[PDB]
């Protein structure tokens, strides 16, 4: 099944939205119902799978929530994103703060390493998401040296098996080279893993790893809508 | 033939526009008709050739669609751009997010390499566009060394004949040195080509290659207008 | 008690808010009462401890005040922040300018060094807060060399015992690695400490240390509200 | 006369303005008349000389037009700029996007090199304008080495006599060190000159050279006003 | 005398404001009277000394005027700044663009060098103001080497005795390390001094010296208000 997983085509998108104060209002039952119906229709259509909806309140100033969804074709993700912005009140009263796009590809050296969403694992309660850009000479470095560096990098995360990693190529889908998403039952586990991962040689070959988006998964869109400002 | 193609003068522009939420509205038949009439008049005039209209939804937060058009004189492009912003409702309800200008010139060493729009090829279904700035010492480097680096760079793209490249000088037309546009029937081909091109020595002489704009070509302006946010 | 203080889990947040001119109005008695009731309810609930409210007027153009609060679970901080933005007029008429999140962890070498808020010290009259990012090679450097550098760094502050330091890990909670907060009875002491600390080898291993937020602690929220613009 | 030209005191300003969509309207006869009267009064007063008015449409997203004007005293330029923003509808419905200030000084080595506006040449149909910041060690370089580098730089532009250069010091008048303005009858000449000038050793001593503003000179302000967005 | 000047406590602030077009209006007599009354009350209170009010029109796009004021305690500056933004129409119709804070301290080596405002000199007709950040290794450099570099730097300004310099520490009061203000009867003298100062070894140890604010001192607030955009 590993060959099928490595050969499968899956576009993934983290759509980060910022709430506009004073636009949502105080009566939100109909907004909740409309958003829930939109997501139910997305699920029924069977093209775009909504991996998660995350509350980003308190993480950074310019973000309020995030939608992680995956589809076989990128045009399906485009249609879902445009429809969410166009035909839902929740989409109309929110601005797009950041979009993280990626396309699933097999790893360069360790082909047994696959994204958590590709392997169909249960999403974690807490997520962190950020783009990544390697150094200019990273890819033309001696393949044995890069393979050893990546092996040490992966070994450094052996003490955090409860944190599931998604490392997806993001070339030509934005300003970045990779999209990284870490899911864990507890946020402190993600923080500790990020702290521990600084002790790796791979840190010498980093150009950009911002912005960060840290959020808590919500069971339903009502829980997210009822906490938004304005 | 090739000498004439290398000697012809052609200005090209990627005009990227962002939709203003709450401005387009829900009734869009007359807006579609007016935009289509504007583009038909542009085609009839025969000065500005609209190479393509692309839907950028889901690519990045600050972009919504893109117009790629080419004219012999830059005054004609200026007039078309101003007229689109001034006399069309679609232009009036959109903000200009980014402009990529370029002027066609023959290549430094491989004079047989020509832009896809200069060759008059059929535009691809998917496009990616970004500006490019080389390193400070790139142009004063030993011409033989730079020629060999560029030859290896080109050779690295031998496995993607279905991805057509447009590399056009952009000096003094903006903040950048080159404008790069890649057209392909499938987006995954563009992503794979961009990933593969990282394994080149030319990556050691890069200063700026952002922002990126990835989009899908639309057959007519109605298809684009009907998906924009209200 | 030191082991428990190094083992306790505490999330800390500096929520920086900017006032919107013309939104607060001139009649502020009811706004003051509502904000005071919100903070009293926060204190009564016993989950989120508001360490301080600080007036940032005159520090920088994009900030007006700041709330420093600490909770055992980050979801409690999220709920408090969202509730402040949603159910108080003061939170509705202000924008979020910057959020500094951190999770308390024991120090790498000097485990006797603890944050002032962890030790339960009385907050100082003046505070300065900024994020911090170390150099790429800082964590993979020889542990003895880094320990010596950090020892010299801490020793350089021998002459400022009245300035209490809070150095908290901030990995995966934002764009930064550390969150630093210095509390002192006098602002000039903070300025002198920051000037003196430039004479350390650790300054050779700094990547980002901005933005800064310098403020005065207010006894009650009325004192802050009565000086806000508009 | 060369000594008199070198000793002459002349402040020059490129004031770049961006049109606010929806503010100018459709009836522009009275606006055109008022702007023309303002510029005629400026010419009659004899203090501020308007070198040119340039249409920047299609160059970059944040610019719409530019005014190049020169006066003996900088307070005269300040007064003219304030009056244009205050007493003309065109000034009131536009935002200031960028200001390039400079004061004429003789060249360091080649004192025969003078700005085109100092020599009183006829302005070209096309202009490009950008600020410039040299490297930190550029000025403390060995004077003979810097003189040789500058001589080679000037010699590299021997094939573009139709492009007139304006290199003016800009220290303490902004964020930059120099203001550069190139005027040519054809835009392609400016593009070719900028491309050719990359093959110089001086490119090794560049820190900032952006933003760029490329525009076409208009005969009268009516031509500019009639093309601005509504 | 000099010991008292080096030991006195003085906070200084440059508050830069940008005018909001369409907010001031055309009838400005009462606004002028209210602003003048506010400044007269500030003078009468005797705590905050307004060193100057400067017209920044034509300097940069994001600035319109500047207030330079000095007080013994930073709380007094905070109160004056908040009161200006809160109780004056001029403060209400303007937005803070940049704040430069500093605290007077004696120089490291040449203790006879004091800020012009500390020595009580008459303010010049023209001012330039900018923040400054030294290199990372500047303060841990060999003290004799740094002293020699600073001596050569100071000596390089031997030919500009008419330009008075204010170099004040700015640590922990913002994003910067130093705040520099140069006052001169003529702006061309400031430009020439800044040009000449580039020929110093100290230029090798600069990290940040922007933004710049150049302005002309006004005799009274009416002169400033009457030129602001409507
Ligand atoms: C539990 C956490 C993590 C695990 C298990 C892990 C493991 C791995 C593995 C096995 C690979 C495959 C490399 C190969 O063989 O080609 C990989 C790739 C990668 N990892 Fe991680 N890693 C973790 C955390 C991180 C962190 C914290 C970062 C960045 C701060 C990161 C950045 C990357 C990137 C960008 C790649 C793409 C390969 C490349 O850059 O060439 N990962 N990771
Ligand atoms: C199918 C894809 C590509 C093909 C066939 C290709 C091939 C070429 C060729 C033949 C040249 C002219 C070399 C010469 O004049 O000696 C060229 C120029 C250039 N290419 Fe590509 N390339 C491709 C992709 C890319 C990518 C991915 C980038 C950047 C990330 C890029 C950046 C450039 C630039 C900036 C130039 C201008 C020449 C210069 O910088 O001096 N190209 N390319
Ligand atoms: C009264 C003021 C200060 C005191 C007493 C102090 C002392 C200390 C001590 C004892 C540590 C423990 C390091 C270890 O044992 O591993 C530490 C860590 C740290 N300090 Fe300070 N310091 C002060 C000011 C500063 C300043 C001014 C900065 C930055 C400009 C700073 C940045 C840091 C950082 C980032 C750490 C985390 C350790 C690391 O980076 O690996 N501190 N400090
Ligand atoms: C037709 C085009 C050009 C001509 C004729 C030309 C020639 C010259 C000459 C003769 C000088 C006097 C240097 C001296 O002896 O002190 C000069 C200065 C200068 N040039 Fe050019 N140049 C041209 C284009 C450019 C370009 C394309 C740039 C930058 C991209 C540039 C940047 C500068 C600067 C910044 C100076 C100031 C001197 C300094 O930096 O120390 N010029 N130029
Ligand atoms: C008339 C103009 C100027 C005069 C008379 C002057 C002179 C001095 C003197 C005597 C000091 C004392 C240094 C010491 O004793 O430790 C000093 C400090 C300083 N000067 Fe200047 N200078 C001038 C212009 C400038 C300029 C143009 C800059 C920056 C572009 C600058 C940046 C600084 C800074 C940042 C310091 C703080 C000391 C330090 O960085 O360690 N000054 N200046």
State whether the beta carbon of D134 lies less than 6 angstroms from ligand 4: yes
The CB density around residue A47, as the number of other CB atoms within 10 Å, is 15
With the CA atoms of E25, E28, E31 and E35 taken in that order, what torsion angle do they form, in degrees rounded to the nearest 10?
Answer: 120
- Name the method of structure determination: cryo-EM
B84 neighbors B38 (Cβ within 8 angstroms): yes
Q: Which helix (H) or strand (E) holds E145?
A: helix E143-156
| CB-facing half-sphere around the CA of B220: CA atoms within 13 A | 9
Structure tokens at A71: 């589809």
Which residues does C118 contact at the CB level (< 8 Å), separation at least 6?
C5, C8, C10, C104, C166
Task: Tell me the structure's resolution in angstroms, rounded to a single decimal.
Answer: 1.9
8 Å CB contact of C171 and A195: yes
Phi, psi of C150 (to 5 degrees): -70, -35
In a 13 Å sphere around the CA of A144, the CA atoms on its Cβ side amount to 0
Using DSSP, state whether E14 is helix, strand or coil: strand
Q: If we measure between CA atoms, which residue out of A22, A219, E131 comes closest to residue C61?
A: E131
The residue among D177, C209, C164 whose CA lies nearest residue E176 is: C209
For D72, the token pair is 């003996």
DSSP C10-70: -EEEEEEEEE-TTTS-S--HHHHHHHHHHHHHHHHH-SEEEEEEEE-TTT-TT--EEEEEE
State the nearest Cα–Cα gap between A31 and chain B, in angstroms: 17
- Are the Cβ atoms of E173 and C199 closer than 8 angstroms? no
Q: In angstroms, what separates the C-alpha of E172 from chain D's closest C-alpha?
A: 23
Query: Could you give phi then psi for residue C14, rounded to 5 degrees?
Result: -105, 105
Contacts of D168 in chain E (CB under 8 A): none
Q: H or E stretch including D14?
A: strand D11-19
Check if A130 is active-site. yes
Quote the tokens at residue B92.
Answer: 């009036």
Q: D74–E60: do the CB atoms touch at under 8 Å?
A: no
Bridge partner list, C204: none
Whether chain A has a CB inside 8 Å of the CB on B224: the answer is no
Q: Which residue of A has its CA nearest to B128?
A: A172
Which tokens belong to E117?
């405002």
**Is the CB of B198 inside 8 Å of chain A's CB atoms?**
yes
Nearest C-alpha neighbor of D39 from the set D65, D57, D19: D65
D positions 36-75 inside 8 Å of E (CB): 74-75
CB contacts < 8 A (B, D):
93
**Vertex D13 angle, CA D174 and D35, to 5°:** 130
Domain of residue A36 covers 3-230
Beta-strand relationship, E178-184 and C65-71: unpaired
Structure tokens at A23: 């636009």
**What phi, psi does C122 have (nearest 5°)?**
-70, 130
Domain count of the fold of chain A: 1
- Sheet strands (E) in chain B: 11-19, 48-55, 65-71, 94-103, 126-134, 164-169, 178-184, 206-208, 213-217
Cα(C221)–Cα(C57) distance, rounded to whole angstroms?
14
Residue D126 parent element (H or E): strand D126-134
Distance CA(B131)–CA(B176), nearest Å, equals 6
Pairing of strands B65-71, B178-184: unpaired
Span from the CA of C152 to the centroid of ligand 3 (angstroms): 10
Q: How many CB atoms lie within 10 A of CB A95?
A: 15
Q: How far is CA D49 from the centre of its chain?
A: 13
Q: Which residues pair with A178 in a beta bridge?
A: A132, A169
Check if C154 has its Cβ closer than 6 Å to any atom of ligand 3.
yes
Alpha helices in chain D (DSSP H): 2-7, 29-45, 74-87, 89-92, 143-156, 187-196, 221-225
Sequence-ordered list of residues with C-beta below 8 angstroms from that of B27, at least 6 positions apart, any chain: none
Q: Is the beta carbon of D130 within 6 A of some atom in ligand 4?
A: no
> How near does any CA of chain C get to the CA of A20, in Å?
10
Q: Are C77 and C14 in contact (CB under 8 A)?
A: no
State in Å: Cα C137 to ligand 1 middle: 18
Percent helix, strand, coil in chain D (nearest 5)? 35, 30, 40
SS3 string of chain A? Answer: CHHHHHHCCCEEEEEEEEECCCCCCCCCHHHHHHHHHHHHHHHHHCCEEEEEEEECCCCCCCCCEEEEEEECCHHHHHHHHHHHHHHCHHHHCEEEEEEEEEECCCCCCCCCCCCCCCCCCCCCCEEEEEEEEECCCCCCCCHHHHHHHHHHHHHCCCCCCCCEEEEEECCCCCCCCEEEEEEECCHHHHHHHHHHCCCCHHHHHEEECCCCEEEEECCCHHHHHCCCCC
What is the three-class DSSP state of B134? strand
Q: Please provide residue C100's backbone torsions phi and psi, each rounded to the nearest 5 degrees.
A: -115, 110
Of D74, D95, D175, the CB nearest to E187: D74
- The torsion defined by the Cα of D103, D105, D109 and D110, in degrees rounded to 10, comes to 100
Q: Is the CB of E128 under 6 A from ligand 5?
A: no
List residues bridging with C129 in a β-sheet: C181, C213
């Amino acid at each position: 099944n590993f060959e099928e997983l490595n050969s499968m085509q899956r576009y993934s998108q983290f759509a980060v939205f910022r709430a506009i104060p004073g636009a949502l209002g105080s009566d939100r039952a109909e907004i909740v119902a409309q958003a829930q119906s939109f997501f139910d229709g997305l699920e029924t259509a069977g093209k775009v799978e909504v991996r998660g909806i995350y509350d980003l309140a308190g993480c950074r100033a310019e973000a309020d929530f995030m939608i992680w969804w995956i589809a076989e074709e990128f045009e399906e993700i485009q249609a879902a994103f445009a429809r969410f912005r166009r035909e839902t009140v929740l989409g109309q009263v929110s601005e797009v703060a950041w979009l993280g796009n990626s396309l699933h590809r097999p790893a360069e050296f360790n082909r047994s390493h696959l994204p958590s969403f590709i392997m169909g694992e249960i999403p974690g309660d807490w997520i962190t998401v950020y783009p990544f850009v390697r150094s200019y000479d990273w890819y033309i470095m001696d393949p044995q040296k890069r393979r050893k560096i990546l092996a040490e990098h992966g070994q450094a995360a052996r003490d955090f098996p409860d944190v599931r990693a998604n490392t997806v190529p993001a070339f030509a889908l934005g300003d970045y080279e990779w999209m990284l998403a870490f899911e864990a039952p507890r946020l402190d586990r993600i923080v500790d893993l990020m702290h521990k991962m600084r002790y790796t040689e791979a840190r010498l070959h980093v150009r950009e790893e911002t912005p960060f988006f840290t959020g808590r998964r919500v069971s339903e869109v009502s829980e997210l809508v009822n906490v938004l400002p304005g």
